[PDB]
Ligand binder design. Sequence first.
Ligand SMILES: *[C@@H]1O[C@H](CO)[C@@H](O[C@@H]2O[C@H](CO)[C@@H](O)[C@H](O)[C@H]2NC(C)=O)[C@H](O)[C@H]1NC(C)=O
Ligand SMILES: CC(C)CCC[C@@H](C)[C@H]1CC[C@H]2[C@@H]3CC=C4C[C@@H](O)CC[C@]4(C)[C@H]3CC[C@]12C
Ligand SMILES: CC(C)CCC[C@@H](C)[C@H]1CC[C@H]2[C@@H]3CC=C4C[C@@H](O)CC[C@]4(C)[C@H]3CC[C@]12C
Ligand SMILES: [Ca+2]
Lengths: 48, 158, 100, 119, 50, 48, 222, 143, 48
Amino acid sequence: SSSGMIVCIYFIILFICGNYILLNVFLAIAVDNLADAESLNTAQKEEA
Amino acid sequence: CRAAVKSVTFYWLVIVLVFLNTLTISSEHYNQPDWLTQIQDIANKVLLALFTCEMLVKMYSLGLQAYFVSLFNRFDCFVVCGGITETILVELEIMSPLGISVFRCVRLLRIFKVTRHWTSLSNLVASLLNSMKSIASLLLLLFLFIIIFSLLGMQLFG
Amino acid sequence: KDMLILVDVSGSVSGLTLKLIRTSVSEMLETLSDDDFVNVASFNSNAQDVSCFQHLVQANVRNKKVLKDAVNNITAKGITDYKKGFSFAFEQLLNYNVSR
Amino acid sequence: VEMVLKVIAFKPKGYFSDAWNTFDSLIVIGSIIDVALSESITFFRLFRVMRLVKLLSRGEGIRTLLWTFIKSFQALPYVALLIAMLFFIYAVIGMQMFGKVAMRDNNQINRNNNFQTFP
Amino acid sequence: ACENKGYYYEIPSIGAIRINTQEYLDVLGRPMVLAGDKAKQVQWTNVYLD
Amino acid sequence: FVSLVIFGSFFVLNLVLGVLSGEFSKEREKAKARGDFQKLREKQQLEE
Amino acid sequence: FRNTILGYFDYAFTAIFTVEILLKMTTFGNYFNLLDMLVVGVSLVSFVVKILRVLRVLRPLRAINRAKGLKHVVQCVFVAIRTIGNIMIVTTLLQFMFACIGVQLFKGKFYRCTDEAKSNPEECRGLFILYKDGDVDSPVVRERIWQNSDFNFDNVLSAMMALFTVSTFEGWPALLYKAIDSNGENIGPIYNHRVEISIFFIIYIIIVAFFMMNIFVGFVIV
Amino acid sequence: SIVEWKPFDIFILLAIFANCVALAIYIPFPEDDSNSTNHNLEKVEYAFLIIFTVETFLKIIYVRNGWNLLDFVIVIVGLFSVILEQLTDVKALRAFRVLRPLRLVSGVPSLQVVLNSIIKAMVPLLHIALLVLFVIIIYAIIG
Amino acid sequence: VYFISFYMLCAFLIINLFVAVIMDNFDYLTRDWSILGPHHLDEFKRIW
Ligand SMILES: *[C@@H]1O[C@H](CO)[C@@H](O[C@@H]2O[C@H](CO)[C@@H](O)[C@H](O)[C@H]2NC(C)=O)[C@H](O)[C@H]1NC(C)=O
Ligand SMILES: CC(C)CCC[C@@H](C)[C@H]1CC[C@H]2[C@@H]3CC=C4C[C@@H](O)CC[C@]4(C)[C@H]3CC[C@]12C
Ligand SMILES: CC(C)CCC[C@@H](C)[C@H]1CC[C@H]2[C@@H]3CC=C4C[C@@H](O)CC[C@]4(C)[C@H]3CC[C@]12C
Ligand SMILES: [Ca+2]
């Protein structure tokens, strides 16, 4: 009851805006760095 | 001179040495028998000597300048420097009740002696090294986000 | 003995550690007889008595009931002041108008 | 009123060409059955909320995303067969090993969570 | 506690209340044992149910 | 509840991951015409 | 009754498959076909029994060689495992090293007594009085047992199982606050003894649960 | 007013970092309790308020900038909070000081760029966010 | 071994299904609406 239920937006915002950043940090390295390694391996074979 | 060090028979020997060194760490458990305790610390110094013998022999075969070229060789001498310090300090008048735990986790760092020759994902490691300015900046932005929400949560629910 | 119980009722004792304190004070009053004189006081930036007694009382079955009831009705709020809490406790042990 | 006002201008023969209006009508009949029956019952009162997706999904950009992925799911039905076969194999094995464990209220194996029945 | 001839107690939970609130009688009896045989006086309680 | 979990969580997580990976891939071919990959290959090729 | 009727159905089922398998052998004189003999072979031999009764779950698995799309999808899975086989070696080495470090830190320190008033096995014996829900007016007599945590770091095998559950983000706060209170080798917990020991769990989650589990998914995508 | 190009810019940046540490070492006590360390940090708050007020009144000589708008609003709330508290959930109003650590992103050009990329990458995800909102609304009404 | 092996297998096949669906949509996910696409033809058909 009362206005104590409105404070729940802190945890909703922290969860939504927190897990979104995690997908733009750890998954931004898995795709912008591992793809380079595969591309580097693809180019390494042609030169070798 | 340097034929033995770069020989293929030397490659297998150091692989074996890393194996039982790891086994001396992974065999430790709660309520372990006294005899197994006696094996671990005895073999801690024995494998230290063999690594030191491998350390001393390797140094007097190629030249100091070439060793510092390799990134791992500087790291490899770092571990053995703490390995000898561990035994001399333990047997000395320093009890260091927690110092055993931290040092035993340092000689575990030579397991990477076998992962330096994959040839299959070492190019991935090179990609994670020149992107440090991009990796660190993203990690710090996440840290600043956590710091702000931790201080905000101290006000509301402190 | 002439006991004087100081109960810390500052803000930081609110919660479980206040329920423990109230049960602890009530349990220590059970170790008293008609030959011992007791009074309970509390302090949070101001030291005051928790009951109507204002000095040491005989600690019989009726007086202890008053103290036990008052101890089970204290709330935690304010800051901690040991200097004001200990001055109040030491002054009440030097009264000597009353039977001790 | 919309249902009758549409057929008198679009004809019943062509009214069923559109996909949305084929199911949109069923809500009208469903809604009017229970209001007549108001003065068993949850089957048609629940369909009242379903009218939200019937017309408010007209935004181009979200419908395309939904349609493209749903069609992609339909085009790869054998990949989801592994998950069902994985669930079938592990559920059957679970009944033999852990199916005889007694259910207790305070335990994790309780009346709601157990291995006693395949579902 | 011991700047004033007392003793220090910890009561972290309900189970510690019963014992820690009666251990202060060990400290109070210190001058009573140092008195010697002059502290060996027979006393009588109030009336209580056995 | 089971349909809510499958549609709400498993399906949406597929959309978020697919769309987010679609933006990490979009910059991958875009960055090809910036020389970052060639510079990284140039230093890697001559490191050996 | 249901098992008997189902058993009756299995009687007629194995007759169809054993008759069908003979036409295959009469007309042909590989590994997938060898599986057909294995599955039906369990039935006749059954007709410890528990091992064979569990083993008859291979019935749906033999349907692979009777569907064009099912063979390809299964084949793609084993090829996909081979590609991701390199990542599963690094992440297993990283978990093993963390488990060995964790053993050095919390070896035997997760023990505690049934009543939170005794902090060593010597006095954690006999009976004690438990107050239900903290009420002093409802005491009850309980035995005190020097118990151990279900997930602990006693050895490397227990540490790896305890660390695996952390990577799934299930019950890891419980293990985190159990490790913070870890005082000593064979003594009970102390409230918030070493908060700084949480660095071990924070580093492991970032390195393994975040970095490796996402570089794994990114590997499959590219 | 003319020297604001580089020399003391680190100092104002270092002032925010120092203010962050003052916020971290504060201990929120239950029921209006406090200790000696919290007593000093209130005085340090007065020192930090003046530094961020002088600079705000010095950069006016910026007002339409997004980052400068955030810097201005926290100061005026800061003066409003200290004034109203002195002349008396008032302590709940000081939660706007938690936005001061956010000023560290604007002080590092090399670190503000990564933040901007993330913010402009939310546009393709807004269609998904809209779909999730409808699904939760539909299931809430069904429930 | 029953629960630990199931968790790894279920997690592996779930992302196997997730990515495979994502694979069938790179044409739409990387649509690049600015330049052109089949959506323009759909508008042409509608006007036609
Ligand atoms: C009783 O204690 C009080 C202090 O607690 C003593 O102080 C006297 O209080 C009375 C009442 O005001 C006055 O006589 C004086 O103000 C105080 N001093 C003296 C010397 O009387 C008091 O002396 C004690 N004894 C009595 C009989 O009151
Ligand atoms: C060199 C290393 C990596 C070899 C692999 C180590 C494996 C095979 C060995 C090394 C130490 C061994 C452990 C040593 C001590 C114990 C405690 C005992 O009560 C149960 C078995 C258990 C847990 C052993 C299991 C097997 C074990 C983990
Ligand atoms: C990548 C992995 C395998 C190696 C890197 C992990 C190292 C850096 C981590 C692993 C566990 C960590 C330790 C965890 C707990 C403590 C106890 C604390 O009171 C001091 C720091 C200390 C000692 C940490 C230091 C850093 C540490 C040793
Ligand atoms: Ca206090």
